[PDB]
Amino acid sequence: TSRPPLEYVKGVPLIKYFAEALGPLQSFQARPDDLLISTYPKSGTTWVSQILDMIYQGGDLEKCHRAPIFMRVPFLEFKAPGIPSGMETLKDTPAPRLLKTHLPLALLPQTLLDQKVKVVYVARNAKDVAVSYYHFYHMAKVHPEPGTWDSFLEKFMVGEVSYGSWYQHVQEWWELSRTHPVLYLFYEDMKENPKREIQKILEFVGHSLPEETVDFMVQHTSFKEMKKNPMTNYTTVPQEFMDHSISPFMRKGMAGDWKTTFTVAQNERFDADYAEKMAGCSLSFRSEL
Ligand SMILES: Nc1ncnc2c1ncn2[C@@H]1O[C@H](COP(=O)(O)O)[C@@H](OP(=O)(O)O)[C@H]1O
Ligand SMILES: N#Cc1cc2ccc(O)cc2oc1=O
Secondary structure (H helix, E strand, O other): OOOOOOEEEOOEEEOHHHHHHHHHHOOOOOOOOOEEEEEOOOOOHHHHHHHHHHHHOOOOHHHHOOOOHHHHOOEOOOOEOOEOOHHHHHOOOOOOOEEEEOOOOOOOOHHHHHOOOEEEEEEOOHHHHHHHHHHHHHHEOOOOOOOOHHHHHHHHHOOOOOOOOHHHHHHHHHHHOOOOOEEEEEHHHHHHOHHHHHHHHHHHHOOOOOHHHHHHHHHHOOHHHHHHOOOOOOOOOOOOOEOOOOOOOOOOOOOOHHHHOOOHHHHHHHHHHHHHHOOOOOOOOOOOO
């Protein structure tokens, strides 16, 4: 098998190479002017990464094409054979740095909280996440075999997928936001009103840009622009690692398209389980626009 099993670390199932990567990651030192992009997988990481990097380049799109987003925004825990690790990439990254992770809080380098690093967190509704992830598993060959949609959806509801439970991830980081600087966004809000969300990000990172530059960012962070941009669309990675003919990384970009995959039986079982897991939480997600 080329698709190795998940390895559990402190309760969290992880890609095996990412588990190994936690070793060198232990020596990682955060700076006070770092910013961390944190998400459960498939919730808009790449989207918000492109947004934050354009802001960092003061809107200059030629600066944003300097390299693929994975090299401009180092992925902390990342590693795979014949690809440079997130830690190796990080050492050539100039400050102020943007950093990406999907780690639950129980694996997050303590340095990031100690240093009070600003967090941009993005949450997305669980149903869209699930569908997105199922397809991602097929094209991104470091994951184990996804199986049928039905058996993947059952694993997703118990957290037996890479990075574990969606339900715990979005709650723990929601709770963290009351004691650490976290801007907590929803993919759906960004779909609804991208300009509004970008203005929130701007206020959060303490920058100012003219209306015209903001409007130029909305354009270049749209699904369509990001899909054809080879610096955001992951098409330059080796086909041994991601195969786009199986499923593109920039797949649909919709809120609400889970309706086209979930059967009615799956939906009813998912809803009942979801109300149990999310009962004590004050988060309200939108499943569609
Ligand atoms: N500019 C954009 N607008 C809306 N969705 C975007 C986007 N850029 C990427 N995405 C979507 O974000 C999801 C992947 O997120 P991550 O970057 O966290 O892996 C994919 O969702 P779909 O598979 O629903 O299309 C991808 O298509
Ligand atoms: N193989 C593989 C990959 C897994 C992966 C997991 C999470 C993520 O945010 C990005 C990723 O990019 C990859 O190329």
